[PDB]
Write an enzyme that holds these catalytic residues in place. Structure first.
Site, short mmCIF file in Angstrom:
data_model
loop_
_atom_site.label_atom_id
_atom_site.label_comp_id
_atom_site.label_asym_id
_atom_site.label_seq_id
_atom_site.Cartn_x
_atom_site.Cartn_y
_atom_site.Cartn_z
N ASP A 75 94.02 57.58 68.47
CA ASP A 75 93.95 57.53 67.02
C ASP A 75 94.05 58.94 66.43
OD1 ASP A 75 93.73 54.78 66.22
OD2 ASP A 75 91.73 54.75 67.12
O1 LIG Z 1 95.07 56.71 62.43
P1 LIG Z 1 94.69 57.89 61.57
O2 LIG Z 1 95.95 58.56 61.07
O3 LIG Z 1 93.90 58.88 62.40
O4 LIG Z 1 93.80 57.38 60.29
C1 LIG Z 1 92.41 57.53 60.31
C2 LIG Z 1 91.83 56.60 59.25
C3 LIG Z 1 92.57 55.26 59.33
C4 LIG Z 1 90.34 56.38 59.52
C5 LIG Z 1 91.98 57.23 57.87
O5 LIG Z 1 92.90 58.28 57.93
C6 LIG Z 1 92.43 56.21 56.82
O6 LIG Z 1 93.55 56.21 56.43
N1 LIG Z 1 91.48 55.25 56.30
C7 LIG Z 1 91.86 54.26 55.30
C8 LIG Z 1 90.62 53.94 54.47
C9 LIG Z 1 89.61 55.07 54.32
O7 LIG Z 1 89.60 55.96 55.10
N2 LIG Z 1 88.66 55.08 53.22
C10 LIG Z 1 87.72 56.18 53.09
C11 LIG Z 1 86.60 56.07 54.12
S1 LIG Z 1 85.41 57.42 53.84
C12 LIG Z 1 84.33 57.55 55.29
O8 LIG Z 1 84.81 57.56 56.37
C13 LIG Z 1 82.81 57.64 55.13
C14 LIG Z 1 82.31 59.06 55.32
C15 LIG Z 1 80.91 59.11 55.93
C16 LIG Z 1 80.56 60.50 56.46
C17 LIG Z 1 80.01 61.43 55.37
C18 LIG Z 1 79.96 62.88 55.83
C19 LIG Z 1 78.64 63.57 55.48
C20 LIG Z 1 78.32 64.71 56.45
C21 LIG Z 1 77.28 65.68 55.89
C22 LIG Z 1 77.25 67.01 56.64
C23 LIG Z 1 76.70 66.88 58.05
#
Ligand SMILES: *OP(=O)(O)OCC(C)(C)[C@@H](O)C(=O)NCCC(=O)NCCSC(=O)CCCCCCCCCCC
Ligand SMILES: CCCCCCCCCCCCCCCCCC(=O)OC[C@H](COP(=O)([O-])OCC(O)COP(=O)([O-])OC[C@@H](COC(=O)CCCCCCCCCCCCCCCCC)OC(=O)CCCCCCCCCCCCCCCCC)OC(=O)CCCCCCCCCCCCCCCCC
Ligand SMILES: CCCCCCCCCCCCCCCCCC(=O)OC[C@H](COP(=O)([O-])OCC(O)COP(=O)([O-])OC[C@@H](COC(=O)CCCCCCCCCCCCCCCCC)OC(=O)CCCCCCCCCCCCCCCCC)OC(=O)CCCCCCCCCCCCCCCCC
Ligand SMILES: CCCCCCCCCCCCCCCCC[C@@H](O)O[C@H](CO[C@H](O)CCCCCCCCCCCCCCC)COP(=O)(O)OCC[N+](C)(C)C
Ligand SMILES: CCCCCCCCCCCCCCCCC[C@@H](O)O[C@H](CO[C@H](O)CCCCCCCCCCCCCCC)COP(=O)(O)OCC[N+](C)(C)C
Ligand SMILES: CCCCCCCC/C=C\CCCCCCCC(=O)O[C@H](COC(=O)CCCCCCC/C=C/CCCCCCCC)COP(=O)(O)OCCN
Lengths: 70, 88, 175, 53, 459, 56, 178
Positions: free
Chosen positions: B43
């Site tokens: 991925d």
């Molecule tokens: O196949 P790839 O090209 O690698 O695609 C990866 C992926 C499919 C996951 C992504 O690029 C994508 O296109 N997703 C589609 C929907 C999407 O991603 N919507 C947003 C989701 S946001 C999320 O992941 C929640 C974040 C939680 C983490 C918060 C961070 C806080 C940390 C604080 C400091 C330590």
């Protein structure tokens, strides 16, 4: 290991040449001056203070102590 | 300093060493030219983690714009060599 | 040293203690001074004797210039330029001499402070008093004259001070 | 030129002033005079104006 | 005094009868010889003066200025040799003639024993400078610059002339010796106030005083390198010398007439220094730093104390040498880059290391690092000002900090960092430029060994 | 070669000749002001047996 | 650095950049390797729970609350590689980098040392001189009208050709010249 590489740098020829020329001319005149001062100090100078003998009027350069100043 | 002058063979060996310790990919299947998404079925998050492992292994950081398009071990080796000025 | 007058630059008799070793351990300071003497003081002394004999081979003299006294500004006419010139030069020479007197007293004070050690506050009273008197006199003579100072301005300052003193004395007597 | 300036004779008369001050201090300490005097010119030759106010 | 004046005059026929390829060599050699001859004026007395004749006299205030004036000419010739390569022989001879005439006028002005004579030569110095600025200047602003440099000056000096002749109809003389020996107090009167202003403003405008300084950045950034050198090193000090001479007849009015200028200086030195923090031109920055130093000199002269006068003399000499060196360094960059913008040529320490050392020494001297004579003058002035009023230290202290900042700023922007990539025409430094910097900087460090030479007549 | 290098280097005598002439000029000025020679109250002196003037 | 930038970052690139930043700052918080491994696996699990979501609006609502949560807990002193733009040796060797053209100003007594190097340098100079005249025309005909749309450069397409604008990239000073 024969991994010697070329070091890219500006030319040091002109700076070195200027420094050598300046040192040469300064020393050219200053070494004889230092030698002459040393010889005058060792062999001649440092007059000693005395009272003016009565009836004698000294010259203007006789009121100074160092031979070069006199 | 006293740092040995790493070579292309050392870079390739270390890259493959780090990749073989990634249990997501089979050590028999991968090669220098084995692609990440298509050849090994990985991925994008896996690619980010692989880049981070490379950065930890070699002690320097790869910018994200350059890191996002490094899809084979061979191009990782080439990027590290170009960054670190490796002759042979 | 005879190079300076001992009365103008006085010094105490310089009483120093005698070595009284208490233990059998040889102190390194004495040995270090002996080797310093042998390795440094002897060659320097020999070079000095050579240079002194060379100087004795050629002996000649210089003299201190003596200056006559001339009438001061207090006996010059208003526009008599020659008398004012002579008086101004004499006053400037006197000003320089007074500056050097203050310098001598300050040197005395500094030497006393260094020499007396931890008891300088009590043992340097005389030098402090002498400096106080000389500083007061110098301040009365020459302070606030400006950069364009002259004998006429000094005379004016003295005249104003004497007028003030006379007024105060008359007021106190007629109290 | 630097050597010439270094050995310029003492026409500013610093050492002369030092010697003169030394002799004056010696004389005044010997005879008990109070070193420097507060008056630059002796008042005997100044004629102050009588106020009579 | 004619033993210096006559050879300076003989420089002109020697220049004009010289071969086409030997003008610079002969001019430099004989100017250096004249400087060596003028070195003998340094033997001064603690007494009145060196009154050679009825027309000329020398003092320990005039002697260092004369030595600086005679020493600046060979340096100006060396600095001008480069950019005047493609010029016809007649015009090069005219340039050298202008420089020689300026030196002659300055020499006479410093030693003149008459106020009117001093005024005439003090104004005669204008014509060669104006011709140099408006003829051999590079940009189109030079014309405007010249106009400013002229009219400001004249606007200050026409009243002075009036005052001068008025004084000679009242005292009967303008000879400085008689004027000093026959001085009389100035009573507080409106007529006396305007006489004070007439006697003071001409010298204030040439220092320049803050608020009357607008001509200086224009003139200094538009002049050729020799013009900048002579303007910053010598022509600014004419006002200081004039105010030092003329304040003897202005007392006790100066006790309260000095307040508006003192403020204008004490605040002004802050403003100009802060101006140096945000400047995109090297020459403009150096000119504003000159304004700040001269504001300090103005304060010193207005305070009217022995320490003030000593500090003012020392600071005048030190600033002359330092500002001339800084202008020469900026010009040596400009002749390679042709821009005169600070942030264009960068990281020059990597490409020119010895020139970077020269830059460091010049910046350190302008920063007043002890025991330079710059700091000697600054500290004497600061102590005198503290005696004048203990609050002044605040402003003085602030200036010190600011000065260091902008000085090091100029050193960091041009010498440190990364080199500009597209600038590929930076050639190794020539022996001429290195010798120019050495001949600027060695006299300063030599003078720190015998400061009494530059401490003026009140030492 | 004499009489050829002169036509190019005769220029180098102008400044030193000016210096000598200036010294000579200075001496002339001094003679005019001798109104008080050996007449000041500070340096008033009796002449030596073979002395005509105290200074020149 | 080497790659030309685009006009904008897509949603996927922004998500991946957040993932890398969050993992790096979590590593800076968790000094030990096993703790970091545990919490990084937890963060990976938290990150891909919305991996399969389809609509753009809420997927953009996520990655906004994620940025806010990251900025609240971002470890104000994160670990930086020493050569990275914030590291302790970022531009340390910048003062030892000298351009190649400076060698053209060397004295002949200096160039007398290293004759082989300067012969090779002359070969390089003549190669550059020919290749430039070819490259200018190649770039002129390969460019769309109205000017370039992206600062990306083409490769060489002929046999003896060289990539256009190659000199100042190939002749970089070095990473550690001295
Ligand atoms: O196949 P790839 O090209 O690698 O695609 C990866 C992926 C499919 C996951 C992504 O690029 C994508 O296109 N997703 C589609 C929907 C999407 O991603 N919507 C947003 C989701 S946001 C999320 O992941 C929640 C974040 C939680 C983490 C918060 C961070 C806080 C940390 C604080 C400091 C330590
Ligand atoms: C960039 C550069 C630009 C330069 C531009 C031009 C420069 C301008 C400068 C001009 C200045 C000239 C000048 O005024 O001279 C200065 C001054 C002149 O003094 P003076 O007033 O003329 O004479 C004083 C007396 O009247 C007479 O004194 P005396 O007779 O008693 O002394 C004897 C004599 C000689 O003394 C001796 O011979 C003996 C004394 C020492 C010997 C000690 C013992 C050793 C022998 C023992 C061993 C052998 C014998 C035994 C062998 C067996 C051993 C077991 O002394 C001398 O002659 C002094 C020599 C110095 C001359 C320097 C001249 C300067 C020339 C200017 C141009 C410079 C160009 C640079 C190149 C110059 C060359 C480098 O000379 C010095 O100052 C010398 C330095 C002394 C310092 C001592 C240490 C001080 C350190 C203290 C501080 C430490 C804390 C930090
Ligand atoms: C300290 C004692 C020294 C005793 C030994 C003799 C020292 C001779 C100094 C001569 C005067 C300065 C000459 C300046 C022009 C340099 C020409 C040049 O390009 O040389 C290249 C030459 C060859 O190098 P390169 O391979 O071409 O260099 C390639 C790059 O350019 C790379 O070049 P770089 O990175 O090597 O750059 C040169 C280097 C050095 O270059 C400089 O910075 C020269 C200017 C430094 C001072 C700046 C003005 C500050 C006010 C000074 C006023 C006092 C003057 C004293 C009389 C001076 C008479 C000339 O830069 C620095 O290290 C920064 C210096 C910062 C000094 C801060 C402290 C200053 C005051 C120290 C206290 C002095 C009085 C103490 C009183 C109480 C105790 C008695 O290297 C040298 O010659 C460097 C000389 C070492 C520095 C001497 C600094 C101490 C001397 C200060 C003045 C004389 C003091 C005498 C009493 C000492 C006790
Ligand atoms: C680069 C690597 C290092 C190599 C060099 C190593 C050696 C270091 C020595 C260099 C400096 C160290 C300091 C040592 C000082 C010793 C010399 C000093 O003592 O002499 C000074 C003398 O210095 C000169 O007086 C000052 C120099 C003169 C400056 C004039 C400039 C020359 C003309 C240039 C044009 C003018 C432009 C500026 C116009 C104002 C003060 O002497 P002073 O105790 O007092 O009396 C002299 C002896 N008496 C008693 C017989 C009279
Ligand atoms: C622009 C950049 C800067 C340029 C340089 C500026 C420096 C020049 C500043 C001039 C210095 C001050 C001039 C006069 C000072 C005297 C003190 C007097 O003004 O104060 C009071 C005077 O009161 C009032 O000031 C009266 C005059 C009011 C009218 C004058 C105009 C006020 C502002 C004008 C400023 C314009 C300057 C620029 C002109 C183009 C004192 O009261 P009084 O005891 O009774 O008078 C004492 C004087 N006596 C003894 C002769 C009688
Ligand atoms: C950079 C621009 C600066 C411009 C110059 C600023 C200085 C202006 C100084 C005043 C100008 C005239 C000076 C007068 C010359 C001195 C002669 C003198 O003092 O005699 C006075 C005469 O004084 C005057 O008449 C002066 C009157 C002023 C007339 C001219 C006005 C000029 C402008 C005045 C205001 C500006 C002054 C300060 C400007 C600050 C800088 C902008 C006494 O005259 P008597 O009648 O003989 O004696 C009285 C007893 N019977």
């Amino acid at each position: 290991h024969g991994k010697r590489l070329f070091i890219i740098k500006p030319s040091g020829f002109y700076d070195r040449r200027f420094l050598k020329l300046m040192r040469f001319y300064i020393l050219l005149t200053g070494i004889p001056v230092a030698i002459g001062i040393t010889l005058v100090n060792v062999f001649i100078g440092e007059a000693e203070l005395a009272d003016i003998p009565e009836g004698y009027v000294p010259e203007h350069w006789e009121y100074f102590k160092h031979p070069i100043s006199r | 300093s006293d740092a040995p002058p790493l070579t292309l063979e050392a870079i390739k060996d270390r890259v493959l060493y780090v990749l073989k310790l990634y249990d997501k990919i089979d050590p028999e299947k991968l090669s220098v030219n084995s692609h990440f998404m298509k050849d090994l079925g990985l991925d994008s998050l896996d690619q980010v983690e692989i880049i981070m492992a490379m950065e930890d292994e070699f002690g320097f950081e790869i910018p994200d714009i350059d890191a996002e398009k490094l899809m084979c071990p061979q191009e990782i080796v080439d990027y590290i060599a170009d960054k670190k000025d490796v002759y042979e | 040293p005879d190079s300076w007058d001992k009365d103008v630059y006085p010094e105490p008799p310089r009483r120093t203690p005698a070595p009284a070793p208490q233990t059998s351990l040889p102190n390194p300071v004495t040995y270090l001074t002996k080797i310093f003497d042998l390795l440094v003081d002897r060659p320097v002394t020999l070079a000095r004797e050579f240079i002194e004999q060379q100087h004795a081979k050629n002996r000649y003299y210089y003299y201190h210039r003596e200056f006559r006294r001339v009438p001061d500004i207090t006996e010059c006419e208003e526009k008599d330029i020659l008398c004012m010139f002579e008086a101004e030069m004499q006053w400037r020479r006197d000003y320089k001499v007074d500056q050097e007197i203050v310098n001598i007293i300050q040197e005395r004070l500094k030497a006393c402070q260094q020499r007396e050690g931890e008891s300088y506050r009590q043992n340097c009273a005389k030098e402090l008093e002498q400096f106080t008197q000389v500083s007061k006199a110098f301040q009365d003579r020459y302070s606030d004259l400006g950069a364009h100072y002259s004998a006429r301005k000094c005379l004016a300052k003295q005249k104003q001070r004497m007028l003030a003193e006379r007024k105060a004395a008359k007021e106190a007597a007629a109290a | 030129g630097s050597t010439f300036v270094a050995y310029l004779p003492d026409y500013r008369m610093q050492e002369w002033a030092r010697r003169e001050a030394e002799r004056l201090v010696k004389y005044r300490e010997a005879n008990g005079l109070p070193l420097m005097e507060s008056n630059c010119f002796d008042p005997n030759k100044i004629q102050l104006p009588e106020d009579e106010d | 005094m004619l033993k210096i004046i006559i050879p300076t005059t003989m420089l002109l026929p020697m220049t004009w009868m010289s071969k086409h390829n030997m003008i610079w060599i002969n001019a430099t050699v004989h100017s250096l010889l004249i400087s060596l001859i003028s070195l003998s004026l340094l033997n001064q007395l603690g007494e009145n003066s060196l009154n050679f004749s009825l027309t000329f006299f020398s003092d320990s205030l005039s002697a260092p200025l004369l030595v600086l004036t005679t020493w600046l000419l060979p340096l100006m010739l060396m600095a001008s040799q480069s950019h005047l390569s493609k010029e016809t022989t007649t015009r090069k001879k005219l340039y050298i003639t202008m420089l020689i005439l300026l030196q002659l006028f300055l020499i006479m002005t410093f030693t003149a024993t008459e106020l009117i004579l001093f005024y005439i030569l003090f104004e005669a110095t204008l014509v060669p400078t104006l011709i140099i600025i408006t003829r051999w200047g590079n940009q189109t602003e030079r014309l405007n610059a010249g106009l400013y440099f002229l009219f400001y000056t004249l606007a200050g000096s026409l009243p002075l002339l009036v005052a001068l002749v008025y004084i000679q109809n009242t005292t009967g003389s303008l000879n400085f010796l008689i004027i000093h020996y026959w001085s009389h107090p100035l009573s507080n009167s409106w007529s006396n106030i305007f006489m004070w202003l007439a006697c003071i403003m001409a010298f204030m405008v040439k220092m320049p005083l803050y608020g009357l300084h607008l001509w200086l950045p224009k003139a200094h950034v538009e002049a050729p390198i020799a013009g900048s050198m002579v303007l910053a090193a010598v022509l600014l000090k004419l006002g200081g010398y004039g105010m030092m001479r003329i304040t003897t007849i202005l007392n006790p009015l100066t006790n309260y007439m000095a307040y508006p200028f003192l403020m204008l200086s004490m605040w002004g030195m802050i403003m100009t220094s802060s101006i140096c923090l945000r400047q995109t031109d090297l020459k403009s920055l150096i000119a504003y730093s000159s304004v700040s130093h001269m504001a300090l000199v103005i304060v010193a002269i207005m305070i009217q104390t022995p320490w003030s006068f000593m500090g003012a003399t020392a600071l005048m000499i030190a600033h002359g040498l330092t500002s001339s060196m800084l202008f020469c360094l900026a010009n040596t960059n400009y002749e390679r880059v042709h821009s005169r913008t600070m942030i264009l040529a960068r990281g020059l320490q990597t490409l020119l290391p010895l020139m970077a050392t020269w830059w460091l020494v010049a910046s350190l001297t302008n920063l007043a690092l002890p025991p330079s004579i710059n700091l000697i003058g600054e500290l004497f002035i600061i102590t005198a000002s503290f005696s004048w009023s203990n609050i002044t230290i605040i402003l003085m202290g602030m200036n010190m900090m600011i000065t260091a900042l902008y000085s090091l700023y100029m050193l960091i922007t041009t010498q440190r960092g990364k080199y500009t990539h597209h600038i590929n025409n930076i050639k190794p430094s020539f022996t001429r430029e290195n010798a120019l910097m050495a001949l600027h900087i060695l006299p300063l460090l030599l003078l720190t060994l015998n400061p009494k030479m530059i401490l003026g007549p009140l030492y | 070669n004499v009489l050829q290098i002169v036509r190019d280097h005769w220029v180098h005598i102008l400044v030193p000749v000016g210096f000598v002439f200036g010294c000579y000029l200075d001496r002339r000025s001094d003679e005019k002001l001798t109104a008080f020679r050996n007449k000041s109250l500070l340096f008033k002196r009796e002449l030596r047996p073979n002395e005509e003037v105290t200074w020149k | 650095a080497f790659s030309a930038p685009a006009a904008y970052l897509t949603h996927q690139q922004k998500v991946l950049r957040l993932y890398k930043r969050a993992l790096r700052h979590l590593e800076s918080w968790c000094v030990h390797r096993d703790k970091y491994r545990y919490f990084a696996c937890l963060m990976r699990a938290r990150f891909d729970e919305h991996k399969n979501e389809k609509d753009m609006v809420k997927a953009t609502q996520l990655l906004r609350q994620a940025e806010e949560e990251f900025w609240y807990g971002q470890h104000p002193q994160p670990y930086i590689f020493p050569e990275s733009p914030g590291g302790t040796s970022y531009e340390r060797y910048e003062c030892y980098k000298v351009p190649e053209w400076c060698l053209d100003d060397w004295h002949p007594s200096e160039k007398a040392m290293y004759p082989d190097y300067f012969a090779k340098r002359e070969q390089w100079k003549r190669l550059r001189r020919e290749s430039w005249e070819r490259e200018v025309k190649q770039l002129q005909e390969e460019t769309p009208p109205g000017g370039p749309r992206t600062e990306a450069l083409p490769p060489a397409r002929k046999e003896g050709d060289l990539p256009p604008l190659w000199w100042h990239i190939v002749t970089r000073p070095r990473e550690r010249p001295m």
